[PDB]
């Protein structure tokens, strides 16, 4: 698995590994989905929080508090993004507090690098870039406009989604955390990590779900097109992206530019009934390889479901954990021992018989802690500096 | 406040203390409301829990973990009840290892700490009945047959469903071989016997259905002399009930008027539809204080029948009530934290930055195991 890491990261574009789904690739896709789901588990969406839109966990406590292995990667940077055009009021979370940490920016994700122990298990010094999407579907997928605009910061022919590009490249000199656009905050950290581990074997892996999957895809093409995976000593490091429930990013020239990048491979996970991969409806093209799943075939989920349940990431990972194909007689059986309770972290999806509470990923008292006064204050974020 | 405890407990039926609302009685009503609210804060309503319908906190951890002062009272018994007629009222677990298929935690009894006695002015025994957070699932469909209560009186007619929960016993059940009535009465007697040489008071609290059960339970105590000690004393019985539906008919009220060691203060919110139940043939008992939570500039207007009914809005209403008159207004006379009204619902305005329904355990009881999986372990380790 560590010895086969190049093939698992798409060296041969996952040919022969998807139908039937290879067992080690099944684990591979899930573990990078866990790093993408970690962006959701740390993101404060409660507008009452004076840290709404920010990560509630510091970089040091990160993997432990999101329920993952803290021995494998080490978080090095949180990156933040802002916008400047009319967007659906669910892309950027805005605090109701007068002591708000920020009025322009949101936590867009985090970058981590494999530890020494993790490098043994992974097979190389892996640099992971995880982009945050949103939990909401109905609030944007049917109303967000999809104008095609150029991306000079990326390509200097290719046209790209106007909304995704604006979030990706908007700067603000009067802002506290987005004087540089989120793109550059990512690239500077990727460059210093590539420089830091230039004497080792290094891979770059981008993860994302929903809107984060579109930003991750554009980010992956961006890294490979501009040689940000090339070190100062002449090494080319491979760029790989595992994206989930991805809406389309660019047009035909964007696909054409993606095809020329020979050190880049994308694997998109697509749930049958999920309507988000349909977006945008005209003029856009997918890029990379695609694995199809159908969470409807799972006997654990509550039939019949809804568009939110077919879109969220933990159902996707549960679907990958048990997928046997999407054919009419494929069935469903868990090939990995992935806890089914994870599916209820942000929604009600499991059947009642499994006795898992709905929307259970929640801090104690939703961040309220009692004072010596006996009153209660919302203290929902770790003590760290931005 | 400790020297005036008899007046605050209704020695003179709170005459001269309700309008304008005396400040010591205002704090007094809120204090007993907090004890009633602890019945909701410890109750596991999540049907996914193996312990649905039971208390999530042990009696040892109770006051600290419900956010109250743990040096004033000390919990001495959890009591349980079951039913035998069709009635939401009883929470049923979906687990195949459910702690109980018949019973629910109906409330708790505590006794004044030594230091609590100095603060309260006497050794007060408190019995707190649990109600419900739901309204429209029963207030417009629950039948209200008038039935006798032989265990209570031996003429008064009382609500069929309330009496059935109050008196149903079940051999085969783990926790209700005795009805919930006898579980309360036995603990009350031994506490009266244990403190028969001191000043003792009995205070019953309750909200919603808990208020009706608390009303029936307080009348039951005074009528059968359960407040009487073996050394001849007759300790006063006081009931502070919130958002109470009615309990009995005119003979129930007539039997209440003859009990001169009993006093009941009902807190009634203007727009709350629950105090109208049942619609015909029933009568209120005790003294009444009217409030109007919709006069508060803190709550998101105009609210709904759930917002007008829950206990924490009631206590916030009492903390800031100036009367229900058109030009009365609203202003907090005590420093009660407004965030408490968002414990079980969304009520505050957005500007106050308090999350909705925030009373919740970490991960709603989920606990990660050493292998990375999660189990629902949402109850203290204690013996039922």
How would you describe this protein?
The PDB classes it as hydrolase. Keywords: Phospholipase A1, hydrolase. The assembly is dimeric. The structure is a homodimer. Chain A has 386 residues and is α/β, with parallel strands linked by helices. Chain A has one domain. The first copy, chain A, is built from ten helices and eleven strands. Chain A has helices at 5-8, 23-42, 62-65, 116-122, 152-155, 162-169, 182-196, 211-225, 252-260, 313-322; strands at 73-81, 106-114, 125-131, 148-150, 159-161, 202-209, 239-244, 264-271, 289-293, 368-370, 376-378. In chain A, the strands form three sheets. Chain A has a seven-stranded mixed β-sheet with strand order 1-2-3-6-7-8-9, with helices on both faces. In chain A, helix 9 (252-260) links the parallel strand 7 and strand 8. In chain A, helix 2 packs antiparallel against helix 10 (313-322). The longest helix of chain A has 20 residues, at 23-42. Chain A starts with a helix and ends in an 8-residue tail after the last strand.
């Amino acid at each position: 698995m560590a010895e086969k890491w190049e093939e698992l990261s798409g060296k041969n574009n996952w040919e022969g590994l998807l139908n039937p789904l290879d067992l080690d690739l099944r684990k591979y896709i899930i573990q990078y989905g866990e790093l993408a789901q970690a962006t959701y588990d740390t993101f404060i969406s409660e507008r009452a929080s004076k840290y709404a839109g920010a990560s509630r966990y510091s970089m040091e406590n990160f993997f432990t508090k999101v329920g993952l292995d803290p021995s494998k990667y080490h978080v090095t940077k949180f990156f933040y993004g802002t916008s400047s055009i009319p967007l659906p009021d669910a892309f950027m979370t805005r605090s109701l507090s007068r002591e708000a940490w920020s009025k322009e920016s949101n936590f867009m994700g985090w970058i981590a690098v494999a530890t020494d122990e993790g490098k043994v298990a992974l097979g190389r010094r892996d640099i992971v870039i995880n982009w945050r999407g949103t939990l909401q579907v109905l609030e944007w997928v049917n109303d967000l406009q999809f104008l095609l605009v150029p991306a000079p910061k990326v390509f200097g022919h290719p046209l790209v989604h106007h909304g995704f590009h604006n979030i990706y490249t908007t700067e603000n000199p009067r802002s506290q955390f987005n004087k540089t656009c989120v793109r550059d905050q990512v690239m500077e950290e990727v460059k210093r990590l590539v420089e830091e581990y230039k004497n080792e074997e290094v891979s770059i892996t981008v993860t994302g779900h929903s809107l984060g999957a579109s930003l991750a895809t554009l980010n992956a093409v961006d890294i490979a097109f501009n040689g940000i995976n090339k070190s100062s000593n002449g090494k080319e490091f491979p760029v790989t992206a595992f994206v989930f429930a991805s809406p389309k990013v660019g047009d035909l020239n964007f696909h054409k530019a993606f095809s020329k990048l020979k050190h880049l491979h994308i694997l998109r996970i697509h749930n049958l009934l999920d309507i988000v991969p349909k977006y945008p409806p005209v003029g856009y093209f997918d890029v990379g390889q695609e694995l199809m799943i159908d969470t409807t075939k799972s006997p654990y989920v509550k039939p019949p479901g809804e568009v939110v349940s077919w879109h969220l990431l933990e159902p996707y990972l549960h679907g990958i954990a048990g997928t046997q194909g999407i054919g009419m007689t494929a069935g469903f059986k868990l090939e990995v021992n992935r806890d089914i309770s994870l599916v209820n972290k942000q929604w009600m999806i499991l059947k009642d018989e499994y006795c898992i509470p709905p929307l259970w990923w929640s801090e104690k008292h939703k961040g309220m802690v009692q004072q010596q006064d006996g009153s209660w204050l919302l203290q929902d974020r770790d003590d760290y500096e931005f």
